[PDB]
Amino acid sequence: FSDKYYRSAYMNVDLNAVASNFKVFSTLHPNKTVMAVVKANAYGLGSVKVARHLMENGATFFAVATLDEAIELRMHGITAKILVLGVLPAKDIDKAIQHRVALTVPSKQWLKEAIKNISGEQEKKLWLHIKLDTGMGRLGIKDTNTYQEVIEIIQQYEQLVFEGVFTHFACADEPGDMTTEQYQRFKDMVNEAIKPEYIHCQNSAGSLLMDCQFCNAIRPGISLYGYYPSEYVQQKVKVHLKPSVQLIANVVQTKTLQAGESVSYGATYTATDPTTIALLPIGYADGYLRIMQGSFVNVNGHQCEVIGRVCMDQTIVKVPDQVKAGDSVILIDNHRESPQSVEVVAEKQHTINYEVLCNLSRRLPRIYHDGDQRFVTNELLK
Amino acid sequence: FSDKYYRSAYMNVDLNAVASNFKVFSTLHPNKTVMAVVKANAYGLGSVKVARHLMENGATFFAVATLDEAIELRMHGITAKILVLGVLPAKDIDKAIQHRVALTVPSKQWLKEAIKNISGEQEKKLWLHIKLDTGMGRLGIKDTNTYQEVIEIIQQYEQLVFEGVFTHFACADEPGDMTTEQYQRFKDMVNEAIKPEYIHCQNSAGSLLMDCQFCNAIRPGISLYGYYPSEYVQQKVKVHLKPSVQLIANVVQTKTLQAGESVSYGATYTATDPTTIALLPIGYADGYLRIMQGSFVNVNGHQCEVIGRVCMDQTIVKVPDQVKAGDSVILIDNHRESPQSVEVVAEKQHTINYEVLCNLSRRLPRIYHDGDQRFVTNELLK
Ligand SMILES: *Cc1c(COP(=O)(O)O)cnc(CCC#C)c1O
Ligand SMILES: *Cc1c(COP(=O)(O)O)cnc(CCC#C)c1O
Ligand SMILES: [Cl-]
Numbered sequence: 001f002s003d004k005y006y007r008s009a010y011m012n013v014d015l016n017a018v019a020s021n022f023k024v025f026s027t028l029h030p031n032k033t034v035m036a037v038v039k040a041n042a043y044g045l046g047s048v049k050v051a052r053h054l055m056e057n058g059a060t061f062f063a064v065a066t067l068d069e070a071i072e073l074r075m076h077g078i079t080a081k082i083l084v085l086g087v088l089p090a091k092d093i094d095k096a097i098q099h100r101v102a103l104t105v106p107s108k109q110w111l112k113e114a115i116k117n118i119s120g121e122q123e124k125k126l127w128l129h130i131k132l133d134t135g136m137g138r139l140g141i142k143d144t145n146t147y148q149e150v151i152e153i154i155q156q157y158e159q160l161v162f163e164g165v166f167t168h169f170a171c172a173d174e175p176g177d178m179t180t181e182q183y184q185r186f187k188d189m190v191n192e193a194i195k196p197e198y199i200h201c202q203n204s205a206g207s208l209l210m211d212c213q214f215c216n217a218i219r220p221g222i223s224l225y226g227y228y229p230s231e232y233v234q235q236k237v238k239v240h241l242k243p244s245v246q247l248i249a250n251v252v253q254t255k256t257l258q259a260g261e262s263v264s265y266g267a268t269y270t271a272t273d274p275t276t277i278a279l280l281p282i283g284y285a286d287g288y289l290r291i292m293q294g295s296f297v298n299v300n301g302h303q304c305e306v307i308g309r310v311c312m313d314q315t316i317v318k319v320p321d322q323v324k325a326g327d328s329v330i331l332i333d334n335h336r337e338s339p340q341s342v343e344v345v346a347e348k349q350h351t352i353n354y355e356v357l358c359n360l361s362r363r364l365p366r367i368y369h370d371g372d373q374r375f376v377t378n379e380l381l382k
Numbered sequence: 383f384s385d386k387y388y389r390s391a392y393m394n395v396d397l398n399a400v401a402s403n404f405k406v407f408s409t410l411h412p413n414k415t416v417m418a419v420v421k422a423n424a425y426g427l428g429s430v431k432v433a434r435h436l437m438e439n440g441a442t443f444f445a446v447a448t449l450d451e452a453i454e455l456r457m458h459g460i461t462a463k464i465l466v467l468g469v470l471p472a473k474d475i476d477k478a479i480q481h482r483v484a485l486t487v488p489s490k491q492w493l494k495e496a497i498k499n500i501s502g503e504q505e506k507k508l509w510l511h512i513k514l515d516t517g518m519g520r521l522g523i524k525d526t527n528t529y530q531e532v533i534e535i536i537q538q539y540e541q542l543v544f545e546g547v548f549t550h551f552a553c554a555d556e557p558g559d560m561t562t563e564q565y566q567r568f569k570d571m572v573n574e575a576i577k578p579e580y581i582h583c584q585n586s587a588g589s590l591l592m593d594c595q596f597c598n599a600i601r602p603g604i605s606l607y608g609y610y611p612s613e614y615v616q617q618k619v620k621v622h623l624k625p626s627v628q629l630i631a632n633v634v635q636t637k638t639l640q641a642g643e644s645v646s647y648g649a650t651y652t653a654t655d656p657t658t659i660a661l662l663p664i665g666y667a668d669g670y671l672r673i674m675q676g677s678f679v680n681v682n683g684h685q686c687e688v689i690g691r692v693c694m695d696q697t698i699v700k701v702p703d704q705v706k707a708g709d710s711v712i713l714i715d716n717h718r719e720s721p722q723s724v725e726v727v728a729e730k731q732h733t734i735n736y737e738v739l740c741n742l743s744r745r746l747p748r749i750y751h752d753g754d755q756r757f758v759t760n761e762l763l764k
């Protein structure tokens with residue numbers, strides 16, 4: 001029954017906006033493969049639906065964080081190339097081979113362990129992308145000799161393929177020399193060995209700000225979904241990105257508080273004079289976190305304050321008398337210049353747009369728009 | 383049956399602890415039905431597994447927030463009584479009837495609309511619990527005349543059953559007279575009409591701090607899972623609750639930063655002298671939010687600082703030289719007196735324990751423990 005929902009709170013996900021943003025990247029980098037980053041459930045949009053729609057618009061390569069994410073894509077019909085960006089436990093190597101998923105090599109020791117765990121039951125090629133650390137300081141190979149040795153090991157085993165090499169920028173969304181230094185260091189390492197088929201270093205910020213002619217693939221994530229990685233990037237670039245997400249809830253009913261009556265846990269809001277309130281069927285278990293108290297939402301065109309504590313499943317809003325049961329409320333709006341933009345919500349949460357999206361929980365249905373056609377995913381009813 | 387998982391980051395969920403906490407409440411209130419609150423996926427633990435286990439230990443009644451949650455329980459074999467605590471859209475009334483789910487009545491107008499939407503295709507009884515507002519100030523009937531009229535409407539339709547009446551405390555977890563006042567107001571209203579089968583007002587805090595002899599059912603949520611609703615409640619009561627959750631990740635690999643090398647986005651941590659770091663395969667898309675930077679985690683017995691920005695899928699920790707790949711890291715510990723307790727994590731997040739648990743995302747497998755038996759749910763592969 002996963003195409004039905006029974007509470008009027010949901011995310012609208014505009015797949016046409018996503019496809020449009022993908023085309024912007026394709027057009028900016030016409031000689032590169034766009035390796036769409038759909039990790040973390042496509043940043044809360046739903047990786048299965050996003051990846052399927054992107055394949056219909058010409059995507060041929062995805063990146064995810066974990067093998068679970070890659071297998072989830074394979075099980076739901078994705079036949080594109082997939083790279084797992086995290087480090088797979090070596091004992092699970094045969095599953096990556098079986099499912100035709102490319103893996104990240106973080107170190108020489110990982111590769112040696114992976115080789116020891118290949119049983120021979122899965123005989124297909126293992127596709128490998130070697131990760132270089134050029135300044136991010138997480139896992140990755142830092143020295144050129146190690147990079148060369150890993151390639152030489154791969155060359156001694158017919159089953160192992162050196163498919164790609166990559167790095168990742170730490171500060172591409174802010175001004176400074178770090179990004180150019182990382183890119184030059186990447187080239188310096190990659191130029192000391194045979195070149196693989198895929199060479200990639202650019203996230204959304206990198207892809208929006210630099211050509212990087214040396215690379216032949218890019219890895220945009222957040223900007224596919226229609227968000228600039230930072231304000232600095234938005235200010236620097238001319239390309240228009242289309243926000244893909246709205247968060248909507250309908251007023252269940254309105255109620256009148258009299259002077260001296262409080263609302264919600266802790267009695268943290270008390271009416272001074274007759275005040276109309278609206279109850280919304282959404283709360284912090286949906287990802288509309290407690291810190292959202294004091295924000296404004298858009299109730300049928302009116303800017304209305306969230307008052308009292310946000311509850312697990314319910315949120316209270318102070319509203320004008322015209323507001324009635326069934327009115328639509330936009331809590332996250334699909335426009336950057338909006339008091340309900342993802343960025344404004346991120347500022348209220350003292351965080352970044354990425355986290356606002358990731359917070360949106362499994363309890364929210366996703367309602368996908370593709371042209372006239374509409375599709376609903378409700379994870380609870382799987 | 384049991385799912386596989388391919389990244390070493392997970393939640394341990396101790397079902398024995400949950401059953402033990404349920405028994406504490408049954409023993410505190412031996413003449414009451416314990417209506418176990420398993421809304422929001424049992425506060426992140428997994429409502430299907432929790433509810434099944436509680437039924438095996440004598441639970442006969444659950445409460446959830448939404449009809450989707452109730453149907454999810456029914457589809458996975460739960461045959462207990464279930465009350466939806468939120469307001470169902472009136473158009474969906476036949477689905478509640480079909481699935482034998484009790485509904486909350488918030489107002490006379492809702493009931494009239496619900497009645498208009500009953501088609502006759504589902505002929506089974508519709509079980510109703512009337513919600514009274516005694517101070518919480520959300521939806522609910524606040525006046526006695528309206529309460530009586532709603533009961534009189536229910537009495538005109540053979541299909542409709544007045545099964546229960548309830549209210550909810552705003553401030554039961556803090557000192558003050560509000561809770562006693564609400565309880566007396568509840569009794570004053572309920573005593574003006576015929577009494578239904580179920581009479582309930584106590585959440586975890588209410589159940590721990592008051593007998594409420596007038597009521598014949600209680601609605602504990604967070605304390606079933608082993609957490610006190612507040613520090614005040616913990617300080618006031620002698621009953622020991624057993625925490626049910628650990629959040630675990632294994633070190634993928636360690637690495638040495640030299641002086642002047644930075645880590646993660648924004649280069650927000652720079653080593654002053656040779657520093658060993660560990661990479662953990664968990665991040666803010668898992669619910670370990672960015673604000674956790676600067677916290678301590680427990681790496682194989684050693685207290686270790688989270689350094690640099692927490693990423694979507696990866697977290698960096700500063701570690702002693704003894705730490706190696708594969709070491710277990712406790713990020714949330716199943717002990718209240720711990721620097722990794724849920725309450726300490728909640729303080730770092732500037733929130734409450736409830737939200738820390740709700741934040742734990744669908745990407746984390748839940749590994750259930752029942753004695754020596756172990757069972758895994760991994761939503762990505764479901
Ligand atoms: C998430 C991520 C991206 C996309 O970043 P945004 O465009 O959303 O800012 C690109 N590359 C990697 C690989 C790093 C590794 C391993 C990501 O993790
Ligand atoms: C969540 C909730 C509970 C349980 O609260 P805790 O024990 O976890 O503090 C009890 N009752 C209601 C009904 C309110 C309504 C409608 C809950 O929503
Ligand atoms: Cl990295």
Ligand code: NA
Pocket residue numbers: 154155156157158159160161162
């Ligand atoms: Na080879």
Ligand code: NA
Pocket residue numbers: 031032212213214215216
């Ligand atoms: Na190129």
Ligand code: NA
Pocket residue numbers: 265310311312736
């Ligand atoms: Na709460």
Ligand code: NA
Pocket residue numbers: 536537538539540541542543544
């Ligand atoms: Na009746």
Ligand code: NA
Pocket residue numbers: 354647692693694
């Ligand atoms: Na980030």
Ligand code: NA
Pocket residue numbers: 358359360361667668669740741742743
């Ligand atoms: Na979350």
